[PDB]
Structure formats: C-alpha cells, structure tokens
Amino acid sequence: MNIFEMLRIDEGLRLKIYKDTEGYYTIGIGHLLTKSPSLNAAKSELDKAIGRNCNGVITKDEAEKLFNQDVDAAVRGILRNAKLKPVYDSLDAVRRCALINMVFAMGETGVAGFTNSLRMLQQKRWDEAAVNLAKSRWYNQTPNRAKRVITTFRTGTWDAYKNL
C-alpha cells in the first residue's frame, strides 16, 4: 500500500461534479473546487483547473493528473510548514502517509491546529494521540475514514486498509 492507493480508498473517484460530505463542490479524487454555493462557480473553477471546457465532466486521466498535483502539493506543504515539518521528520514511513492523508483532507492549516495531537505524535505516544485525535469535529463528521487514519497512527501498520 502507498499514499495514492490509501487516498483513493478514503476519497473515492467521481468523474462528475459532486458535493462533498461538507456540502462542497468537489471532483475526481477528493479535489475541492469551491466552498461557494454556485454550481456555476464550481464549473468555472473546473475549466480553469483543467484547461478546457468540461461542463462538469472529466476523464480518469484528468482526475489522476489532479490527484498527482494534490498529493505533491500536500507533501511540499508539510515540508515547508514550520509546525508540520518536524513532526513529519520524526515519523516512520507509514505514519508519514497518515499525516499526509490528513493534510490532504483538511489542509495544512487545519492540521497544524491539532497542536496537542502533533506533540504526542512527536513524542511517539501512540495511544494518547489516537484518543486526542478522536476528539475533533473531523472525527465526528467522518468517523469511518477518521478512524482508519487514527488506526494508521496508533499502529504504524496498514491494517485499517486491509479489508478495502
């Protein structure tokens, strides 16, 4: 298992504009277009992100191009971030994927807000961090995916992804 397969599990793939859990205009593999209410705003973001008139629809190839960008931006973001970087450098490879998954889902800013959990992760306090992370709006809104991520952090194994 790798980060792309892991995110493909958690995000799904939709070749047409769709509304996210949160109510937002999203496309392909978890690619947020706009937080705004207009399906037209979303269709515009969409043509600009692709470079063609899409009319709400993309090909696999395109969704995967988008996804390559996203993951890439997620990892460079972490590495550039002063809170994030040191946590990342301190973790083993699987746990790294887990931080990357979160950052991808809720942006750098959101993640770095998890001040206490980040500190436990850095201290390698696995169980404690798992509990702290569960006490979030994120956990409450998308319990099954948040649980898979937390498990990934608690264990350092791909277990949570091995039934999917």
Curated annotation (Swiss-Prot):
Substrate binds at residues 32, 104, 117, 132. The keyword Transport does not apply. Changing residue 11 to N: Loss of 84% of enzymatic activity. Keywords: Antimicrobial, Bacteriolytic enzyme, Cytolysis, Glycosidase, Host cell lysis by virus, Host cytoplasm, Hydrolase, Viral release from host cell. GO terms for biological process: cell wall macromolecule catabolic process; defense response to bacterium; peptidoglycan catabolic process; viral release from host cell by cytolysis. It is found in: Host cytoplasm. Changing residue 20 to A/N/S/T: Complete loss of enzymatic activity. Changing residue 117 to I: 500-fold decrease in enzymatic activity. Optimum pH is 7.3. This is Endolysin. Pfam families: Phage_lysozyme. Its EC number is 3.2.1.17. The active site is at 11 (proton donor/acceptor), 20 (proton donor/acceptor).
